[PDB]
Each structure stands twice: as structure tokens, then as C-alpha cells.
Design a protein around this ligand. Structure first.
Ligand code: A96
Length: 288
């Protein structure tokens, strides 16, 4: 809100947008066509308020926009393309469009199209999810969080429902029961810090390697849940996890926030895990 707004760089004409079917509601996000928004026609996502909403919501939408302008560009964070702020129409924030939707559902739908890895004749696993994909998505989300962390940002709601999937397996962090993703201090003291987001990154990890599963299955989210979380109880390994990966899930869920890895340590670690899987996959593919 204190951050300045460079209209000469981000302002887009309202009549250069044809709004289409809605995506989500909470303001509301919509799919759309933007003409000339980049250097001829492109698909975009527009977040706009309603008719007569609370001046506050306007203020909120504006500050959300300035935050995005502040954060900057990174391949793994939803990209801001423009915004209509001047008088004449409603306030709109325009970002790139990700066709495949949130990561959880996308994964949830590939449960009948998964193989640990591929070998000849690999044409039987066309459009199949594999460990490499899963670790790759985890690597990218980590890089985007290391980025955001590097800018003093704090997501506060990092989950699979807030990860978008684009062309060529590129995931992006965006921001549209949350208790299931919160760390102990965040639930009991109401404290949000970069470390608590790592806690959540851990919950995200579990979601990915459980192909879109809901965390803490069958548990009610009542007082007992909160107590067990506080006493050291943790989720069991998901169905598509590897041993190293599950352990990383455990590290992120460390009770002592300072003892949780950092997003830089996580990037460093997943990068390696990805490179090893790759190597094994090369040997698997070579022999058979
Ligand atoms: O959901 C959005 N776009 C979108 C893209 N593709 C498919 N569906 C929706 C979106 C739109 Cl239309 C406008 C602003 C933001 C947005 N802003 C944001 C605010 C604070 C922090 C962050 C993040 F950097 F943490 F991601 C993003 N995240 O996601 C959006």
C-alpha cells in the first residue's frame, strides 16, 4: 500500500479485454482475451471486484497488485501482465493464464496415468506422470518460495490449491480447511514467518506425492488434532513418495521452527534428488 504505482508501465485499457467464463469466486477471477497486452491476442486471468463493494476491498485489491509489482518476475510465481486502475471502470489485476488449473486437481486426475519412470517402448507412457514430474514440480515451487523469501514475503497459505500448472510442466505459485496446512506456532500463537511457510511447503510435498490427496485423511479438525500436532504427531508417508522425499517432509514439519530447513537448503536438496532420479532413469532406460 506504501509501494508506488507506475501507471506508465502496467496500465491496460479496459476495452482491450473481452471477459470470458469465470474461474473462481471468493473478489472473483475470470478468464479473458487481452489485445495488445504484450508488444497480438492473448489469454489472461483477470481478478476484479464487484459492483459497490467496500472501499476497503478496493484498497486491498490495490495493495495486492502493488505487492506483485514489488515482488518482481520469477518463472515460478504467477506473472502480472497488467492492470486497469484509472477511473472509468472497475479495478482489475491481470496475470498470465495457466490452462491446467490448480495442481491438486491436475494430479488427482493423473492417478491412472502414472509410472515411476519410462523405458522403451516409451510410447505406452505418453502424457504420463512420473517421479521426475513430481520432484520437478516440487523443485520449482521451492525455487519460487526461495525467491519470495528473498523479498521478505510470506505466503501464509501455501498449498496445492494455490499452485497453477502451465504448458510444458511449469508450475507457478499464485494466491486465490486451512488448519491442515498451518504450523503449530501459527495455530497457537498466530505467528506467520518464513519458517511456517516451510512447514506448509512440507504439507504441499505430501499433497504432490499423494497425487492430489487431502491431508490428514479421516481426521476431524477439532481440538484433538491441534493437540497431536503440538505433541509431535505426523502424517504417514504418501503412496507415491520416495524415502528421501518423505524425510524432507518430516524435516519441514520440525516442531522447532529454526530447525526446519530453509527454502535455499530445499532447492539445493531437491535439485540433487531430481538429478539422481534422472541418472537412475537413464540407467533404467538404457538397460531395458
Ligand atoms: O489467480 C490468479 N490468476 C490465475 C492464473 N491462472 C489461472 N487461474 C488464475 C491471480 C490474478 Cl487474476 C490476479 C492476482 C493474483 C495473485 N496475486 C498475488 C498476491 C500476493 C502474493 C502472490 C504470490 F506471489 F505469493 F503468489 C500473488 N495470485 O494469483 C492471482
Amino acid at each position: 500500500e506504501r509501494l508506488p504505482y507506475d501507471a506508465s508501465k502496467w496500465e491496460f485499457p479496459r476495452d482491450r479485454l473481452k471477459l470470458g467464463k469465470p474461474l473462481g469466486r471468493g473478489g472473483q477471477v475470470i478468464e479473458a482475451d487481452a489485445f495488445g497486452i504484450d508488444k497480438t491476442c492473448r489469454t489472461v486471468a483477470v481478478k476484479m471486484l464487484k459492483e459497490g463493494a467496500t472501499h476497503s476491498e478496493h484498497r486491498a485489491l490495490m495493495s495486492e497488485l502493488k505487492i506483485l509489482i514489488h515482488i518482481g518476475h520469477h518463472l515460478n510465481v504467477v506473472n502480472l501482465l497488467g492492470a486497469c486502475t484509472k477511473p472509468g471502470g472497475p479495478l482489475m489485476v491481470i496475470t498470465e493464464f495457466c490452462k491446467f488449473g490448480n495442481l491438486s486437481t491436475y494430479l488427482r486426475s493423473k492417478r491412472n496415468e502414472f509410472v515411476p519412470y519410462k523405458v522403451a517402448p516409451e510410447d505406452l507412457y505418453k502424457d504420463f506422470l512420473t517421479l521426475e514430474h513430481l520432484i520437478c514440480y516440487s523443485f520449482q515451487v521451492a525455487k519460487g518460495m526461495e525467491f519470495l523469501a528473498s523479498r521478505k514475503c510470506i505466503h501464509r497459505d501455501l498449498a496445492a490449491r494455490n499452485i497453477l500448472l502451465s504448458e510444458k510442466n511449469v508450475v507457478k505459485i499464485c494466491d486465490f480447511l486451512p488448519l491442515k496446512w498451518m504450523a503449530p506456532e501459527t495455530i497457537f500463537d498466530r505467528v506467520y514467518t518464513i519458517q511456517s511457510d516451510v512447514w506448509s511447503f512440507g504439507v504441499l510435498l505430501w499433497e504432490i506425492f499423494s497425487l492430489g490427496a487431502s491431508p490428514y485423511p479421516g481426521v476431524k479438525i477439532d481440538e484433538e488434532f491441534c493437540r497431536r500436532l503440538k505433541e509431535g504427531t505426523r502424517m504417514r508417508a504418501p503412496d507415491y513418495t520416495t524415502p528421501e522425499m518423505y524425510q524432507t517432509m518430516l524435516d519441514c514439519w520440525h516442531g522447532e521452527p529454526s530447525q526446519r530447513p530453509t527454502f535455499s537448503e530445499l532447492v539445493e536438496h531437491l535439485g540433487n534428488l531430481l538429478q539422481a532420479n534422472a541418472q537412475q532413469d537413464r540407467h533404467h532406460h538404457h538397460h531395458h
